[PDB]
């Protein structure tokens, strides 16, 4: 049965483009990052402003939660990542090493490691406790648009404008597999699926694809949206109907049926590119965020 996501709250406060929103694993909070150099924390269910976290010298392209909902990591144009204690709002560590904008980041499930991708075309693996880089992977031949650990942290998937998705062995940093397209469009986002066996990849030819990791081939293709210019997050929605969720450059949130690939909803309201969406871990709630003409985050709820 098709979802009926409806706008419940609009979250204002950032002063430039929002870049990324993420729900805490415990379901309590939403974190947002922005080109305004700030991270903001909001109540996950009602969008209530909680706090602002500051320290980066330039704008931020991504933020991510640790598994216990206590830490954040952010990726900044200032060429660093920062690890934050959410409760105090203080910077615990500044991760230095990248030679150009840091674009994407994630903790592993154990949350002892952070992975980052940068416009310097590398992927780095960092130790959370020491704040020091463990491995630098010569991952790609163009900017790295996304990085994500699998469900036991043993694998990292990375994507790049070079047209490749690569899967890396976390422990050794060595490449296990490269996912290949003849037509080779820039890859703007990748993420492992909730069951651990698929990878969802966005390409800048208005397409999302679900890849079978084991077989190294595409299973599902999702189209209808607009995506040629920005690295827009995408998600698996699993709390109710099994959907794929993405932002779009026509200012809409798109929701597809994972199995049938049919568009089941388009959420209207934003007035600029929807750069980021996230799905609540237990409730049927979507967060979306938009670029500079809008600069708000919206919370949508569905009955199913």
């Amino acid at each position: 049965v098709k979802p009926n996501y409806a706008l419940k709250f609009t979250l204002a406060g950032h002063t430039k483009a929002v870049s990324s929103v993420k729900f805490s694993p415990n379901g309590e909070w939403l974190a947002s990052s922005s080109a305004d150099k700030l991270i903001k924390i909001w109540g996950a269910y009602d969008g209530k402003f909680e706090k602002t976290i500051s320290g980066h010298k330039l704008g931020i392209s991504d933020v991510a939660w640790s598994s216990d909902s206590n830490l954040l990591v952010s990726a900044s144009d200032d060429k660093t990542l920062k690890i934050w204690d959410v409760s105090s709002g203080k910077c615990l560590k500044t991760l230095k090493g990248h030679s150009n904008y840091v674009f994407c980041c994630n903790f592993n499930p154990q949350s002892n490691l952070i992975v980052s991708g940068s416009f310097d075309e590398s992927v780095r693996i960092w130790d959370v406790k020491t704040g020091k880089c463990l491995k630098t992977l010569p991952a790609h031949s163009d900017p790295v648009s996304a990085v994500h650990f699998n469900r036991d942290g043993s694998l990292i998937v990375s994507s790049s404008y070079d047209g490749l998705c690569r899967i890396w062995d976390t422990a050794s940093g060595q490449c296990l597999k490269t996912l290949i397209d003849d037509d080779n469009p820039p890859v703007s986002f990748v993420k492992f699926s909730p069951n651990g066996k698929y990878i969802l990849a966005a390409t800048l030819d208005n397409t999302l694809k679900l890849w079978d990791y084991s077989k190294g081939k595409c299973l599902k293709t999702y189209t209808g949206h607009k995506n040629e210019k920005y690295c827009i997050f995408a998600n698996f929605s699993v709390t109710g109907g099994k959907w794929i969720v993405s932002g779009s450059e026509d200012n809409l949130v798109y929701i597809w049926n994972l199995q049938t690939k049919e568009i089941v909803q388009k959420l209207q309201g934003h007035t600029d590119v929807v750069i980021s969406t996230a799905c609540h871990p237990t409730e049927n709630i979507i967060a979306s965020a938009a670029l500079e003409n809008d600069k708000t985050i919206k919370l949508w709820k569905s009955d199913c």
Binding site: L58, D62, Y161, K229, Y230, L291
Partner: peptide, 14 residues
């Protein structure tokens, strides 16, 4: 610099 303030909000060049 990225005129919009961060890499992700900057449109990709050809």
């Amino acid at each position: 610099v990225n005129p919009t303030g961060c890499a992700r909000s900057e449109p990709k060049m050809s």
